[PDB]
Write a protein that binds this ligand. Structure first.
Ligand code: HEM
Length: 188
């Protein structure tokens, strides 16, 4: 997992559960609370799993519940650490921009396997976003969408269209409907 993104999760975990829980979890994997992750660093996915596992044991919360809360609260962290991706944009533009963003930030990473997040208009007031990844982080995905709604102050409804797993890849397709139209028909 791209290092600087893991850095945001650590900060978000501190907001949710405290410096003690987090410091203890990082210590269990040999980290240093004051460690500064660089833009070119890649953090082993298994290390992230162990960190979250420790948070789970310390807080007594299910790992999936933690990922959901981290997704919900991480949008705020992103807004502070990567302000340029926000800056006055509207929720729909933000969401449709994510697929390209993930490809960009993992361009020069060791093996590079970013989640695909293709979004496409399906109505004047809705889009279909499909999560595709070997990691199956459905809860984080759904939480980030909820948090995006809260951050941008734009009410939405999220309906699961379908989910599946094939050849190692997990897929989750949701239909996001906005309260007000965000698209108009234009000649193709
Ligand atoms: C400005 C905000 C965001 C930035 C800068 C960002 C960047 C990234 C990056 C670079 C990763 C690590 C990927 C890797 O190392 O392979 C990641 C993970 C992930 N991001 Fe984002 N992200 C942002 C917002 C979002 C949004 C809004 C969604 C969903 C609607 C999303 C869904 C995910 C998922 C599900 C993962 C977990 C890894 C996986 O499932 O394979 N991200 N993000």
């Amino acid at each position: 997992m791209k290092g600087t993104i893991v850095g945001t999760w650590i900060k978000t975990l501190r907001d949710l559960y405290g410096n003690d829980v987090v410091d203890e979890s990082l210590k269990s994997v040999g980290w240093e609370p004051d460690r500064v992750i660089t833009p070119l660093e890649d953090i082993d996915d298994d290390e992230v799993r162990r960190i979250f596992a420790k948070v789970s044991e310390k807080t007594g919360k299910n790992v999936n519940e933690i990922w959901r809360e981290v997704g919900r609260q991480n949008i705020k962290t992103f807004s502070e650490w990567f302000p340029s991706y926000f800056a006055g944009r509207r929720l729909v533009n933000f969401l449709m921009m994510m697929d390209e963003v993930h490809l960009q930030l993992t361009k020069m990473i060791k093996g590079a396997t970013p989640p695909r997040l293709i979004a496409k208009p399906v109505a004047k007031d809705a889009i279909e976003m499909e999560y595709v990844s070997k990691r199956k982080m459905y809860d984080y995905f759904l939480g980030l969408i909820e948090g995006s709604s809260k951050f941008f102050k734009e009410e939405i409804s999220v309906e699961e269209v379908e989910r599946g797993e094939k050849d190692g890849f997990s897929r989750l397709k949701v239909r996001i409907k906005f309260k007000n139209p965000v698209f108009e028909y234009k000649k193709n």
